[PDB]
mmCIF file of C-alpha atoms and ligand atoms in Angstrom:
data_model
loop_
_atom_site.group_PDB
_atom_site.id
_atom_site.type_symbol
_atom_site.label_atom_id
_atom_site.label_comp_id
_atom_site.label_asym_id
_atom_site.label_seq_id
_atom_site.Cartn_x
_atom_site.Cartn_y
_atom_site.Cartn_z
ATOM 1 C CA UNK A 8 -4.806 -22.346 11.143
ATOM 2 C CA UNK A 9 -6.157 -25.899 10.538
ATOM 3 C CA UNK A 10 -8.116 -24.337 7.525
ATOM 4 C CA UNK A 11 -8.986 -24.452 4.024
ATOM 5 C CA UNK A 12 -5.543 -23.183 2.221
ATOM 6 C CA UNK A 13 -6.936 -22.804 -0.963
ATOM 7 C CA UNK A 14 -9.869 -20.108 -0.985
ATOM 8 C CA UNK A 15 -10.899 -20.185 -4.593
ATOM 9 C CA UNK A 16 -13.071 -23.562 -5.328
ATOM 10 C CA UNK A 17 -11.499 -26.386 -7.584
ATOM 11 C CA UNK B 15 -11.487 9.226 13.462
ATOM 12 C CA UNK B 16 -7.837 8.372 11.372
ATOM 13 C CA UNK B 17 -4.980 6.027 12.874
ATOM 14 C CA UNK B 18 -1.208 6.601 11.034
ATOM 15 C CA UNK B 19 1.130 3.956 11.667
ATOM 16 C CA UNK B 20 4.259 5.663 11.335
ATOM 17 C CA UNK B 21 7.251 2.923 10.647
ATOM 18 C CA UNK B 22 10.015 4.320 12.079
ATOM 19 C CA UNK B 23 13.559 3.981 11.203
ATOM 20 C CA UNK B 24 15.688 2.914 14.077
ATOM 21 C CA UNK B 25 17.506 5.453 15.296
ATOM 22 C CA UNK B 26 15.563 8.880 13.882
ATOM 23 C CA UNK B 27 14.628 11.165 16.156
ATOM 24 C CA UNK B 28 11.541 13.251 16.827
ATOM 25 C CA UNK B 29 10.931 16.643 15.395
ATOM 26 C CA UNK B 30 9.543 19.838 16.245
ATOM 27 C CA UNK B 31 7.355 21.763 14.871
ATOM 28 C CA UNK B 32 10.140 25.121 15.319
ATOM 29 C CA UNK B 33 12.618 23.033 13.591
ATOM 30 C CA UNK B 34 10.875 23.581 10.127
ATOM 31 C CA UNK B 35 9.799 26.782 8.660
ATOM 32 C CA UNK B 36 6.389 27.080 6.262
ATOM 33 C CA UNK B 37 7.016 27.951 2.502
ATOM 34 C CA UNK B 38 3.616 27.690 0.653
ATOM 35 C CA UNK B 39 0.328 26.121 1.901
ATOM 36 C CA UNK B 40 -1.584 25.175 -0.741
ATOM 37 C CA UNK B 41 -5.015 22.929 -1.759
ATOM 38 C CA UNK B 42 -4.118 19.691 -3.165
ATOM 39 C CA UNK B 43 -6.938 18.455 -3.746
ATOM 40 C CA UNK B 44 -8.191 15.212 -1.897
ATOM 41 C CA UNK B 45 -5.212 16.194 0.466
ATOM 42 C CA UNK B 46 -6.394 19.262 1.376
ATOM 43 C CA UNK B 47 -4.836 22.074 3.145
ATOM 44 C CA UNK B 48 -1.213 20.995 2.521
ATOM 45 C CA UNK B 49 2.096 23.059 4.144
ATOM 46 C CA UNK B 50 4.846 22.525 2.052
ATOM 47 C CA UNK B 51 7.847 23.039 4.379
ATOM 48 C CA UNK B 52 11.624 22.827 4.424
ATOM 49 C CA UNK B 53 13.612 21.533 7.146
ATOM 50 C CA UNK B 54 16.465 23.671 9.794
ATOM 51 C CA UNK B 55 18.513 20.995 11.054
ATOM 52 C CA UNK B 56 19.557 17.036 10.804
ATOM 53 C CA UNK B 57 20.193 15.491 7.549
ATOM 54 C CA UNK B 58 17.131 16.942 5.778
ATOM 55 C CA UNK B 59 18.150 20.324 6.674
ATOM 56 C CA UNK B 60 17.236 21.932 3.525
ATOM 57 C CA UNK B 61 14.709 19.756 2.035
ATOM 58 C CA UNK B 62 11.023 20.882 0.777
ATOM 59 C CA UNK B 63 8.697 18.250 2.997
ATOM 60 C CA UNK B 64 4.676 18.501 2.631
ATOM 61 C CA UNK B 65 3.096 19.283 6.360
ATOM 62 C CA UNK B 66 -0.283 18.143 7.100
ATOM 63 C CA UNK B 67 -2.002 19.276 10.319
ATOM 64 C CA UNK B 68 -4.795 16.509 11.579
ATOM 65 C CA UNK B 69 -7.161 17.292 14.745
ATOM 66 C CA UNK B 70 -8.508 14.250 14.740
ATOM 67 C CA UNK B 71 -5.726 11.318 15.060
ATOM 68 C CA UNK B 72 -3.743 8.575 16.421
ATOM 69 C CA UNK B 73 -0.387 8.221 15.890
ATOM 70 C CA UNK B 74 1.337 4.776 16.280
ATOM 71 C CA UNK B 75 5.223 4.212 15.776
ATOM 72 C CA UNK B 76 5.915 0.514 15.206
ATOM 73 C CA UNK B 77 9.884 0.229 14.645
ATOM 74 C CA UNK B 78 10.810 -1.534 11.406
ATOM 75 C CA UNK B 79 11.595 -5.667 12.165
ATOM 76 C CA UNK B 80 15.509 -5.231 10.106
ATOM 77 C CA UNK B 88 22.735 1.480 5.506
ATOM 78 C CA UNK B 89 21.442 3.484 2.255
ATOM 79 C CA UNK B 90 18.580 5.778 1.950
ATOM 80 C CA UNK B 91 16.921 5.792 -1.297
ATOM 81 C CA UNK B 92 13.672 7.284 -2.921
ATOM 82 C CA UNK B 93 11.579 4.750 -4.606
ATOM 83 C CA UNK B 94 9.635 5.550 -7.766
ATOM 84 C CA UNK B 95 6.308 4.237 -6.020
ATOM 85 C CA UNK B 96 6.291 4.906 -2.578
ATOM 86 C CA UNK B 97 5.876 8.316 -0.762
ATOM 87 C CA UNK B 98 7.080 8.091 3.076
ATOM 88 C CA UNK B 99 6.101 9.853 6.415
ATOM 89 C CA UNK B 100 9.545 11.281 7.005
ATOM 90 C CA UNK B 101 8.442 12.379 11.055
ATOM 91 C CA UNK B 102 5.448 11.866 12.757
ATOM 92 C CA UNK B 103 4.418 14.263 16.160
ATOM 93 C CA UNK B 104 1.556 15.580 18.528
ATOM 94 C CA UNK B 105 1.670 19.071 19.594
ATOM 95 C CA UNK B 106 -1.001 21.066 21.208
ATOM 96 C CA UNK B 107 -3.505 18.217 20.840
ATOM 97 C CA UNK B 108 -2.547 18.329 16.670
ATOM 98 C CA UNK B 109 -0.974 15.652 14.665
ATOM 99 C CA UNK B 110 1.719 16.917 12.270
ATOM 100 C CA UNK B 111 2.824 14.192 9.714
ATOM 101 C CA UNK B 112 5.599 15.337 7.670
ATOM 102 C CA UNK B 113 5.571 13.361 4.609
ATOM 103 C CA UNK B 114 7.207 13.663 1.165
ATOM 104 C CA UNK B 115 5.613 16.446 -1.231
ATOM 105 C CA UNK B 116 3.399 14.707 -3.897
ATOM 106 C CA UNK B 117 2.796 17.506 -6.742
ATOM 107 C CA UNK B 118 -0.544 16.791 -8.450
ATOM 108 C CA UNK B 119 -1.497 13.944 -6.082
ATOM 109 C CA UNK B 120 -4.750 12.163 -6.169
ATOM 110 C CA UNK B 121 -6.353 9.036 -4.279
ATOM 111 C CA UNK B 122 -6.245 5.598 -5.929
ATOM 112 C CA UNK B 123 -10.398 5.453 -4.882
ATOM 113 C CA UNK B 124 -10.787 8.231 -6.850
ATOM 114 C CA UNK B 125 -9.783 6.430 -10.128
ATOM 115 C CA UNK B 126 -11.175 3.399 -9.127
ATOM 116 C CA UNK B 127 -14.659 4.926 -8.767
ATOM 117 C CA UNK B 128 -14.566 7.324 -11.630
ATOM 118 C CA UNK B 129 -12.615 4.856 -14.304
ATOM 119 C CA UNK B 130 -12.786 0.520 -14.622
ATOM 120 C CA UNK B 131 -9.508 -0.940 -15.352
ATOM 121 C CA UNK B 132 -8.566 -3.310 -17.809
ATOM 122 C CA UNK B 133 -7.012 -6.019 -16.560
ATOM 123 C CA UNK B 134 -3.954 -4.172 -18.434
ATOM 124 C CA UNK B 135 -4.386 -1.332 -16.573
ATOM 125 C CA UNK B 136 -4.275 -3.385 -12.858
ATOM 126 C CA UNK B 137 -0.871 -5.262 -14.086
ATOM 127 C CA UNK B 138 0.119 -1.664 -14.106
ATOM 128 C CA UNK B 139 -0.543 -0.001 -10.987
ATOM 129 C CA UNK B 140 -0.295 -3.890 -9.369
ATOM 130 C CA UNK B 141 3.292 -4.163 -10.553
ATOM 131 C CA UNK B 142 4.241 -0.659 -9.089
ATOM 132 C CA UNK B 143 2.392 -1.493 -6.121
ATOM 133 C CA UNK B 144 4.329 -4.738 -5.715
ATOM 134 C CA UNK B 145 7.799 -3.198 -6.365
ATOM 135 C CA UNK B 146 6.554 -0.630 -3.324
ATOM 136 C CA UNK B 147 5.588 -3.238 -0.878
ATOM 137 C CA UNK B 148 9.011 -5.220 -1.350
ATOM 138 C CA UNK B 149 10.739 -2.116 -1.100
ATOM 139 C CA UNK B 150 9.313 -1.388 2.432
ATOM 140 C CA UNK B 151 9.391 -5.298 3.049
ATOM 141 C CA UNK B 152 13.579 -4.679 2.499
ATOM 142 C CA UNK B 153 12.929 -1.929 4.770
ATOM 143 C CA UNK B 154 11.740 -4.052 7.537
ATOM 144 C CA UNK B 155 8.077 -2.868 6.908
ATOM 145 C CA UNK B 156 5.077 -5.123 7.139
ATOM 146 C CA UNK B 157 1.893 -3.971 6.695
ATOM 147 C CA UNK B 158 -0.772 -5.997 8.101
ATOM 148 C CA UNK B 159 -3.603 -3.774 6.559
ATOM 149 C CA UNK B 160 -2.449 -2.858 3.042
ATOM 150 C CA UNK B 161 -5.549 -1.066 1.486
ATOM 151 C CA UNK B 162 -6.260 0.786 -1.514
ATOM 152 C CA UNK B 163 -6.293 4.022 0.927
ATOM 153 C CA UNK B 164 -3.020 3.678 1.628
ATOM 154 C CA UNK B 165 -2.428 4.009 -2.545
ATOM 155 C CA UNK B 166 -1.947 7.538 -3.781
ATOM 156 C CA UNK B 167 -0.809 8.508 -7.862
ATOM 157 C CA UNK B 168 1.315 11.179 -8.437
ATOM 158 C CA UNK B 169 0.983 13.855 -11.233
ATOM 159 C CA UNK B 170 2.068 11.247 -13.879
ATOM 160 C CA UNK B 171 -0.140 8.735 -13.040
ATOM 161 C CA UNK B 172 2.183 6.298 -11.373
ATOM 162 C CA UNK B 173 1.334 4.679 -8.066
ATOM 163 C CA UNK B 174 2.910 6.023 -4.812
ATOM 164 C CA UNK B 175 2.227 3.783 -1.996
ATOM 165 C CA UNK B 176 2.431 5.373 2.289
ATOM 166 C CA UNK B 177 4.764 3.500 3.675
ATOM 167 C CA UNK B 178 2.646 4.593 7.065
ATOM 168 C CA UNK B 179 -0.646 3.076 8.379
ATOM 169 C CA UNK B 180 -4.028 4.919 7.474
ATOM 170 C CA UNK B 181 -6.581 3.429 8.991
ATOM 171 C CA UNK B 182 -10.149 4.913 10.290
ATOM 172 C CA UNK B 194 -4.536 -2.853 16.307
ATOM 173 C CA UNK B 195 -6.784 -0.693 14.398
ATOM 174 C CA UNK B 196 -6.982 -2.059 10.630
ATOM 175 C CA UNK B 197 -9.266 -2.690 7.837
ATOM 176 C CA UNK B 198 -9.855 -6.546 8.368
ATOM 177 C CA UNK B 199 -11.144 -6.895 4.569
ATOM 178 C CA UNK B 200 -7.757 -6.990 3.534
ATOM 179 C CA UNK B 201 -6.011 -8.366 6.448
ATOM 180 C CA UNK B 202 -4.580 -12.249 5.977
ATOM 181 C CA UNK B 203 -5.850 -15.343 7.654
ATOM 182 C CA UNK B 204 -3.023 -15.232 10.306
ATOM 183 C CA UNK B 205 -3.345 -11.543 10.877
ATOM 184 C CA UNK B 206 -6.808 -12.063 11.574
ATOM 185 C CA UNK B 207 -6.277 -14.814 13.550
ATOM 186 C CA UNK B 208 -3.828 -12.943 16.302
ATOM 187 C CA UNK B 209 -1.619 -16.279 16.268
ATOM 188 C CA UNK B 210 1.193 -14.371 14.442
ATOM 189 C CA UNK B 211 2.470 -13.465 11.162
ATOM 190 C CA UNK B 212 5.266 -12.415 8.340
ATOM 191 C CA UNK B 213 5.342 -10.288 5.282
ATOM 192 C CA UNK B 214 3.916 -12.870 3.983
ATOM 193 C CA UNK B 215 0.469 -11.694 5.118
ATOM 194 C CA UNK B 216 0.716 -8.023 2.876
ATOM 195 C CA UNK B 217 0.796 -10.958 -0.087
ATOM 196 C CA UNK B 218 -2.767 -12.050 0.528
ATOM 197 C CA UNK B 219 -3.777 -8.202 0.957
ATOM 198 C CA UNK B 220 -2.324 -7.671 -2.106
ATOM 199 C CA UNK B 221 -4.400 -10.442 -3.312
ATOM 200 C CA UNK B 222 -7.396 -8.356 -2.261
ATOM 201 C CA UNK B 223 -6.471 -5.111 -3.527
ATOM 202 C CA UNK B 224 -6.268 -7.401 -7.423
ATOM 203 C CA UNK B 225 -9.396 -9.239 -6.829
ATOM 204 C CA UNK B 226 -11.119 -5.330 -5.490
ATOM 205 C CA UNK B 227 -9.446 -4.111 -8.938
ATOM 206 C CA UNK B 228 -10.465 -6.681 -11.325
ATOM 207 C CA UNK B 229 -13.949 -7.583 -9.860
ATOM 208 C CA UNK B 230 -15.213 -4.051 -8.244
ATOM 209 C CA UNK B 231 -16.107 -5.785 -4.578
ATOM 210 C CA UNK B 232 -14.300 -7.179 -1.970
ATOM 211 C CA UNK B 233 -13.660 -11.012 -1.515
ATOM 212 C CA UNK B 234 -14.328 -10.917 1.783
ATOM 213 C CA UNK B 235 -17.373 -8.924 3.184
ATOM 214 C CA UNK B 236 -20.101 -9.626 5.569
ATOM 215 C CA UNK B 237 -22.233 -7.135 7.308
ATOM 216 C CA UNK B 238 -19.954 -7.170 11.053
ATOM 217 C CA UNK B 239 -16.385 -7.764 11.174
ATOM 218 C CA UNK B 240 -17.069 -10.872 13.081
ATOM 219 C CA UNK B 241 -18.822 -12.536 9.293
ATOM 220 C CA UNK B 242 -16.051 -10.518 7.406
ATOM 221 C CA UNK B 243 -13.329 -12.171 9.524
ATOM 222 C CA UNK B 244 -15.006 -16.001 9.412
ATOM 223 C CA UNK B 245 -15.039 -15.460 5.656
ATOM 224 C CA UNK B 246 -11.381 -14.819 5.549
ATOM 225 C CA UNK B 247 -10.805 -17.726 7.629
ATOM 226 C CA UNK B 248 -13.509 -20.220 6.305
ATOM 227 C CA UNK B 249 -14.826 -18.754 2.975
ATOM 228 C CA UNK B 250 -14.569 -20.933 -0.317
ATOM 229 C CA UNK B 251 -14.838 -18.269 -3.194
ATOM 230 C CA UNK B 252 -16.039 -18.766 -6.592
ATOM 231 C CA UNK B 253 -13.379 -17.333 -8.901
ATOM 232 C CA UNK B 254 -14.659 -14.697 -10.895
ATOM 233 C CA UNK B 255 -14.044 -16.462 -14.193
ATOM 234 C CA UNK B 256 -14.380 -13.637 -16.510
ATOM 235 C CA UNK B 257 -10.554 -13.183 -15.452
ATOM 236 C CA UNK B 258 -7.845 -14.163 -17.531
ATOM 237 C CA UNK B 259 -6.146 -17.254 -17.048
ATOM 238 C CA UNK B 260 -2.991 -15.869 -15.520
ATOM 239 C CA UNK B 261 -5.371 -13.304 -13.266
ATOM 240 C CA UNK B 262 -7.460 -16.437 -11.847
ATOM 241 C CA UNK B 263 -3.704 -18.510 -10.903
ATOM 242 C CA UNK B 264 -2.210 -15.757 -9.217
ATOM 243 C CA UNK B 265 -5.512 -14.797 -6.793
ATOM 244 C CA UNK B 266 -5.432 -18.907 -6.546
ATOM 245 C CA UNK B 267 -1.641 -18.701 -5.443
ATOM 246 C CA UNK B 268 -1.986 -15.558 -3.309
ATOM 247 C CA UNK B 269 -5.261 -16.536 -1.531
ATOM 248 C CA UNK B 270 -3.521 -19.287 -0.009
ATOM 249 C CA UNK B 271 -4.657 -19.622 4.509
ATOM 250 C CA UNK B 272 -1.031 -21.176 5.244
ATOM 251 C CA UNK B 273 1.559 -18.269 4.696
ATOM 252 C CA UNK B 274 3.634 -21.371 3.554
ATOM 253 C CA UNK B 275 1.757 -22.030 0.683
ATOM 254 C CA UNK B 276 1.470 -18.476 -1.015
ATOM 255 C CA UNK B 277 3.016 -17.234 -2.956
ATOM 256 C CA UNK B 278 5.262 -14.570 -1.943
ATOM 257 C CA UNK B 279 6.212 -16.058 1.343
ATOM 258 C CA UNK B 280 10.036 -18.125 0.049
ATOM 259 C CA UNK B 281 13.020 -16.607 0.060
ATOM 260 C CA UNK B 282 12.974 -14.471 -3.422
ATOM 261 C CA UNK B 283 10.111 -12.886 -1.963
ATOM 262 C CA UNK B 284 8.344 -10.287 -4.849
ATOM 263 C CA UNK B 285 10.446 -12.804 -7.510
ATOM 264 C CA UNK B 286 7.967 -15.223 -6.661
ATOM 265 C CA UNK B 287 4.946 -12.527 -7.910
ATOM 266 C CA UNK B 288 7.093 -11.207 -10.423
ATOM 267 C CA UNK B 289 7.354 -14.042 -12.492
ATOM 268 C CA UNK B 290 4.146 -15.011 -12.953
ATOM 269 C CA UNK B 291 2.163 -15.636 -16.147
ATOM 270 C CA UNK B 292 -0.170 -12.602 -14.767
ATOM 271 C CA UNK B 293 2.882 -9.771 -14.598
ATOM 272 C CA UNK B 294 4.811 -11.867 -17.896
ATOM 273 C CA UNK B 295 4.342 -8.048 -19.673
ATOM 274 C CA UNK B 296 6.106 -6.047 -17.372
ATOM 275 C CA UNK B 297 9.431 -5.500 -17.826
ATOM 276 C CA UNK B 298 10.252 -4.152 -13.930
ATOM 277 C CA UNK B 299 13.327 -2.647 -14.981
ATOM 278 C CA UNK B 300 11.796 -0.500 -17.500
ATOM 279 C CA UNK B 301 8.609 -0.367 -14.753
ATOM 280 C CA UNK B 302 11.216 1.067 -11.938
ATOM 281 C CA UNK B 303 12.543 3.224 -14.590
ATOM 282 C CA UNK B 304 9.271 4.982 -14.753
ATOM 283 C CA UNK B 305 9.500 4.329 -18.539
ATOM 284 C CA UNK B 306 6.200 2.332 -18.757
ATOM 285 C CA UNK B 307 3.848 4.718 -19.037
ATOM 286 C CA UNK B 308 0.790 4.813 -16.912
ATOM 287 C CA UNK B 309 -2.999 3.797 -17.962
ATOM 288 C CA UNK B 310 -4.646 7.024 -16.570
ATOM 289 C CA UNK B 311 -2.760 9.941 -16.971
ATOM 290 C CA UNK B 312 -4.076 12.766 -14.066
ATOM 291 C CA UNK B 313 -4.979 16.529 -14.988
ATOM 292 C CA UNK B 314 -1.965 18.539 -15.777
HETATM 293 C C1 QCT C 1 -3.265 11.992 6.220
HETATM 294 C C2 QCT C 1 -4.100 12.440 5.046
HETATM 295 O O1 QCT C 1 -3.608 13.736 4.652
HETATM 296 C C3 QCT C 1 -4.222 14.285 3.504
HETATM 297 O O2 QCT C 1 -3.993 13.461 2.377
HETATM 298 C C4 QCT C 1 -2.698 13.107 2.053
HETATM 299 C C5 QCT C 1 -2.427 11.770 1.801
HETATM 300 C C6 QCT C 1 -3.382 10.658 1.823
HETATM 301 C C7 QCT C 1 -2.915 9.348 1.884
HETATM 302 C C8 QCT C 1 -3.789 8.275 1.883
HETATM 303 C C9 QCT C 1 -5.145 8.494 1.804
HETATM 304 O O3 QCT C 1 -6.011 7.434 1.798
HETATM 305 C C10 QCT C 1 -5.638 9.795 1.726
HETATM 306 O O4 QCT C 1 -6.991 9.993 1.646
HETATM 307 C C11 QCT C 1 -4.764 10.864 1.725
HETATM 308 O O5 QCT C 1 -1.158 11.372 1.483
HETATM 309 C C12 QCT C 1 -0.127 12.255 1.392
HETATM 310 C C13 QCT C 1 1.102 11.723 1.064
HETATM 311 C C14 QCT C 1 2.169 12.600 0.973
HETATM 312 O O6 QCT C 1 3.400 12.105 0.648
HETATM 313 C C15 QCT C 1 2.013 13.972 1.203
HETATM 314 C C16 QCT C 1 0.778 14.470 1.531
HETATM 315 O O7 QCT C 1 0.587 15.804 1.765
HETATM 316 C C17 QCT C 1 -0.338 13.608 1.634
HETATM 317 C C18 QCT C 1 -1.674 14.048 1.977
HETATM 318 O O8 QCT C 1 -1.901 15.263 2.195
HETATM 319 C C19 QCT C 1 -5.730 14.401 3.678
HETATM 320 O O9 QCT C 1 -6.035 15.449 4.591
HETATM 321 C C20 QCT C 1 -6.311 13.078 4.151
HETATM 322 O O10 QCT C 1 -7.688 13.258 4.462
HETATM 323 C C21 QCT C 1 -5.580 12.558 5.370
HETATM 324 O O11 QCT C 1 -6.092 11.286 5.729
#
């Protein structure tokens, strides 16, 4: 993984 | 061509095509030439089963990761699965007035109303076959018929044209480094934001910029979504299976009690008492 968890932006 | 994924209990046995017997063969529809059949021996013995014929496809039997049988309100299941004479017969479960979820979705937009709906039936399906030791990998609105009253009747097999559709396949599916149930979540994710929005959240031109997207993408949320719409594709869009929701121990609960699904009541929903947005010609 090592990736962005959340997809949506803030 | 087309690729079933037949999930197998453990256990059945293969069929034959001698070992049913054809009562009517009839058009419907989008599922074309349809045998409707009824069994000579086992348990089913005696039980009206549709029979499609395919020329052109692959049949894959992945056992079921684990007793009552039981007939859910929103899933239809391939019963037996075999290749004779260089022909695939799938015998599934007859769907009377059947049509394609795409169908809908091209002809109709939903409300956001209207995807709680078939959403909430398609989640009760998916933990169903989740309890069944089912995990789908490739969840897709082809694999998500509607029966003659509307309500949503997910396969329980594969249908793809590992062969999947990688738009709605989860970071760790994607990845090949191993997943859980947790991974039909995120699909499910897809199929809500494909429902809501009209395109896919992940799509390049190859599979290669479609994959990286799933794995890299930041997306902006489509923010004429309600509230509750926008925190549940938030909590289900999450790379680390750990972190979405879906993926503890209540499973579907998790979905379920979200401010997004807060109208359903799922009893009433299972109960086929909630009556559907779009009711099909009858
Ligand atoms: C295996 C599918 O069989 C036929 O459609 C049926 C489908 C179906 C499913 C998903 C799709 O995306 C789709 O286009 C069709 O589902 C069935 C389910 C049943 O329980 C019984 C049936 O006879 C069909 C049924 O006849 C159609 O020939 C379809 O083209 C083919 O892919």
């Amino acid at each position: 993984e090592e990736l962005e968890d959340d997809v949506f932006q803030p | 061509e087309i690729a079933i994924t037949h999930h197998v209990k453990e256990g059945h046995e293969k069929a034959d095509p001698s070992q049913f017997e054809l009562l009517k063969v009839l058009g419907q529809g989008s599922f074309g030439k349809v045998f409707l059949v009824k069994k000579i021996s086992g348990s089913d013995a005696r039980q009206l089963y549709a029979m499609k014929v395919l020329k052109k496809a692959t049949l894959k039997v992945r056992d079921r990761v684990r007793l009552v049988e039981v007939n859910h309100p929103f899933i239809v299941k391939l019963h037996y699965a075999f290749q004779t004479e260089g022909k695939l017969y799938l015998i599934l479960d007859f769907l009377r007035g059947g049509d394609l979820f795409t169908r809908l979705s091209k002809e109709v937009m939903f409300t956001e109303e209207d995807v709680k709906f078939y959403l909430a039936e398609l989640a009760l399906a998916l933990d169903h076959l989740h309890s069944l030791g089912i995990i789908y990998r490739d969840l897709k609105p082809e694999n998500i018929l509607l029966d003659e009253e509307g309500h949503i009747k997910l396969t329980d097999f594969g249908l793809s044209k590992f062969c999947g559709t990688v738009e709605y396949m989860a970071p760790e599916v994607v990845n090949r480094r191993g997943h859980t149930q947790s991974a039909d979540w995120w699909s499910f994710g897809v199929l809500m934001f494909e429902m809501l929005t009209g395109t896919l959240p992940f799509q390049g031109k190859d599979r290669k910029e479609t994959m990286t997207m799933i794995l890299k993408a930041k997306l902006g949320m489509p923010q004429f979504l309600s509230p509750e719409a926008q925190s549940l594709l938030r909590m289900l869009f999450k790379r680390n299976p750990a972190n979405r929701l879906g993926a503890g121990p209540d499973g579907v609960e998790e979905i379920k009690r979200h401010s997004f699904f807060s109208t359903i009541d799922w009893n009433k929903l299972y109960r086929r008492e909630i009556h559907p947005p779009f009711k099909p010609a009858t």
